[PDB]
Structure formats: C-alpha cells, structure tokens
Amino acid sequence: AWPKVQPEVNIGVVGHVAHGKTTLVQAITGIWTSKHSEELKRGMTIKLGYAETNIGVCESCKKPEAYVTEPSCKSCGSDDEPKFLRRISFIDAPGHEVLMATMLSGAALMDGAILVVAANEPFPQPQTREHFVALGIIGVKNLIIVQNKVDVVSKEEALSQYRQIKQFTKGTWAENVPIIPVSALHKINIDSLIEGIEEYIKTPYRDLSQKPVMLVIRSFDVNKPGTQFNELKGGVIGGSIIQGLFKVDQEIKVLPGLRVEKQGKVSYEPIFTKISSIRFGDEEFKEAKPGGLVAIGTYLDPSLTKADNLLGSIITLADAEVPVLWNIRIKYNLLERVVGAKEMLKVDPIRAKETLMLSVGSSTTLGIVTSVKKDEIEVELRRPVAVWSNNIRTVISRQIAGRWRMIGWGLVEI
C-alpha cells in the first residue's frame, strides 16, 4: 500500500476555453473538477477546480509506462508494487476571458503549471497568450505545454502546430519548456505527461520555519440536512499554505478580517479562532504544510464562512505581524499591449483617478490611483489587503470595453 499524505505540490492547468484543461485533470486523477451548478450546465469551469492523485513508478518497467497513479504495475506487466513518489494536486483554472481574475487568484497558489493547447484550434488563441503571459508575470516558470486533442488532427497538422508553439516560446523565458502531445479524452500518452510532471515540475523547496501564511480561496458552511441535533459545526476555510505550517488546536487569525461597523465607518476586524480540524481531499491530518488545497476547520459561526465569504483573505498564527493596508504603493511595469483581446491594442499609461483592479495573493480588489510616477503608483483600495511579505507580486488590470484586462504588474512595497 501507499502512504496517506497531503499533496506536496500544486500544478496549475491553464489555457484557452474548451482546450481540454478539465478533461486533462480527469485523465490524470479520475476526477471531474466542476462541482458548481452553473459549471455543469455550461460545460465550462468557472470557479477554481481541484483534484489530487498519488504518483508512483514501477521500477521493473520501462518509462514512461512505468509511471502510475495507483498502487499497481499491472499496466506495464509487473506484479511488483510501484515505488511511491509523491502526492500531487491540480488547480484547474477557468480559461474564459472574463474570468481572468479567478485564474490569477489560482496562479498565486501554483508551484508549476500545464498550459493546455488544443491541436485543432488556431494558435495562439487569446487566453493561450494571456495565461502564458500571466504565468511569466507571476513567476510560475516550471511549465509544461501540453498539445491536447491530437486524436482529431493528422500527424502533419500536429507537427505544424508543434513548430508554431516552439517558435512562440523562442526568445522567451519558456524557450526550453517541453511540449507533450496527448489526448485527454482518450487517455493517450498520459504516462509521458506524468513523467514530464516529475521531471519538470519538481516539488519546490519549502520554508517551514517562516511565519505560517495560508491564502484563502474558499470558505464553507459544511452543515448539512439529516444529521444529528447537536451544535453547528464550525466554519471551514479553504486555501493553500504558501509558507510555514499549521497544526490542529493552533490559535490563528484571518486577515484583514470581518467587515464590520466601527465609529460610524466601515472597518475590518481580524477574526481570531482556533484550528479544529485539517483536511486534504477526503483525509484528515494533524498538521498542514505547503502543497495541496487544505480545508481548515474552525470554531467560527458558519455564517462568517458561508459562500466563500472569506475569499482573498489570509490566515496566519494569532500573534503574527502582517500588514493590512487600505492604501498601497506599487513599483510597477506595464505590458506593451492587451494580450487577452482578440485584437491586441496598445496599453495606455496609468493616470491618476483611474479605477484599477489589483490581484494580490488570492485577493482581488478595486482601487483608485491617487498618485502616478514613472515606476510607482499609489492606490486607495475599496477594501484593505493583507500583505504578508516585503515584495509580493501584484497584477494590475484595467477595464477596457467592458472587460477587465491585465495591463501590468509590480511589487507591493511595505
């Protein structure tokens, strides 16, 4: 048997709408990540999807068939148990152009990524480009490009697009990233992709002694009908631990906290609570480390956590010092053009009084520009943000023709 452990790495799955991201995750994990009503109705990912799998290798078999996702080597002709390598997880992003803020929020949780490119669609589609650019900006450079749907193109067509893709990455940070052809739908060459994941998306070094920080992407009321008449189960908060570690019974706080009234004005009150339970997937643990999306059980009134109320928050230890800022200063750079549009228009300089959208960690916030300089802006936010380190990446978006468009990035200065 394989050990039961948390995932140790998060692999993003990104790319243009319907190119096959969710089907790819299903091919690897057996899981269909879409679980919301609207997602099932539209056949499209809307919220961040999530799935885990164990990875092992059959030492008696040849690669890539030696790589397996369950404790059996029967697939490559061996009765031996495969050697366990690690448990991995996938962050399945929405690829729709209007959902970029959600993709960006998930990118903050990625240790590496797969860019899925459909072989039977013109290359490069708008969100093939946009997600590629966003990965580079956020620094998710451990990338595999997957050429999907090769089952419905000729070999000649596949090779032609392959050349296209290599030329696209030529002269970029991604010049040497591998391109792996698969059919997610028919599970062809998935073993090569597993081998690729092991080679190119290694588990990164972690800093377990740094102040614990979890970025929140979900929060739940897990109380359900038909269960016993005791007091309500506490609110559950979901996200990814980006540094340090958390343990059951630890005093924690949620930042910025709860929107409340104080002295006639809107304020944010840090939410203090204690960790009651820790879960990854269907399994409980006594502590939680970077890697995987974790469910932190708390003693909070479920009304405080219901329906992703705490999305964009962070969790730290109760006594930790973390800046919570209503006004931020960003050392920024602008992209040359708007890559996510079907026609790439030039990016205009940032002007004072503009309302911009800021992606910081898992949070997405609107604010007004109060000051513009050559490499520096100041922004008055509609809601404060937790800034847990001195040089955190932010992505800057502007509303252009009714859509939020990524136009730049920078560092939040504290």
Ligand X SMILES: Nc1nc2c(ncn2[C@@H]2O[C@H](COP(=O)(O)OP(=O)(O)O)[C@@H](O)[C@H]2O)c(=O)[nH]1
Contacts with Mg ion by CB under 5 A lie at 21-22, 45
Those residues with Cβ within 8 angstroms of residue 118's Cβ, 6 or more apart along the chain or in another chain: 15, 16, 18, 19, 20, 125, 148, 149
Other Cβ atoms closer than 10 A to 42:
12
Breaks in the chain listed by the residue before each, with C–N > 2.5 Å = none
Cα 375 to Cα 330: distance, rounded to the nearest angstrom: 8
Shortest Å distance, C-beta 43 to ligand X: 6
Of 2, 5, 17, 158, the one binding Cl ion (CB under 5 A) is 17
Q: Which is nearer to ligand X, 26 or 394 (CB)?
A: 26
Q: Which tokens in the block code for residue 65?
A: 């068939």
Q: Does 398 bind ligand X (CB under 6 A)?
A: no
- Residue with Cβ nearer ligand X (207 or 284): 284
Coil vs helix vs strand at 265: strand
Q: Give the orientation angle of helix 100-107 with respect to helix 126-138, to 10 degrees.
A: 30
Q: Which of 20, 82, 95, 408 binds Cl ion (CB under 5 A)?
A: 95
**Which DSSP letter does residue 102 get?**
H
188 contributes a contact to Cl ion by CB under 5 A = no
The yes or no reply on residue 256 touching Cl ion (CB under 5 A) is no
Residue from 148, 273, 359, 397 that binds ligand X (CB under 6 A)?
A: 148
The piece of 13-21, 240-248, 355-363, 388-396 that touches ligand X (CB under 6 A) is: 13-21
- DSSP SS3 for 187: coil
Whose CA is closest to 55, among 125, 118, 8, 111?
8
Nearest approach, Cβ of 131 to Cl ion (angstroms)?
A: 10
Q: Helix, strand or coil for residue 310?
A: coil
Q: Which does 142 bind (CB under 5 to 8 A by kind): Cl ion, Mg ion, ligand X, none?
A: none
Contact (CB, 8 A) for 21 and 15: yes
Nearer to ligand X by Cβ, of 222 and 245: the residue is 222
- Residue 334 partner contact from Mg ion, Cl ion, ligand X, none using kind-dependent CB cut-offs of 5 to 8 Å: none
Give residue for tokens 């809601």.
Answer: 383
Partner residues linked to 358 by β-bridges: 365, 396
Residue 17 or 334: the one with the smaller Cβ distance to ligand X is: 17
Distance in Å, CB of 7 to Mg ion, minimum: 19
Q: State which of residues 149, 206, 289, 405 lies at the interface with ligand X (CB under 6 A).
A: 149
- Coil, strand or helix: which one is 17? coil
The option from Mg ion, Cl ion, ligand X, none interacting with 196 (CB < 5 to 8 A, set by class) reads none
What is the distance of C-alpha 191 from the center of its chain? Answer: 23
Closer by beta carbon to ligand X, 220 or else 404: 220
Could you tell me how far CA 236 lies from the centroid of its own chain? 19
Binding mask 271-310 for ligand X (x = CB under 6 A): ------xxx---------------xxx-------------
| Residues found near ligand X in the complex (CB under 6 A) | 15, 17-23, 44-45, 95, 148-149, 151-152, 183-185, 220, 222, 233, 236, 277-279, 295-297
| Residues found near Cl ion in the complex (CB under 5 A) | 17, 45, 95
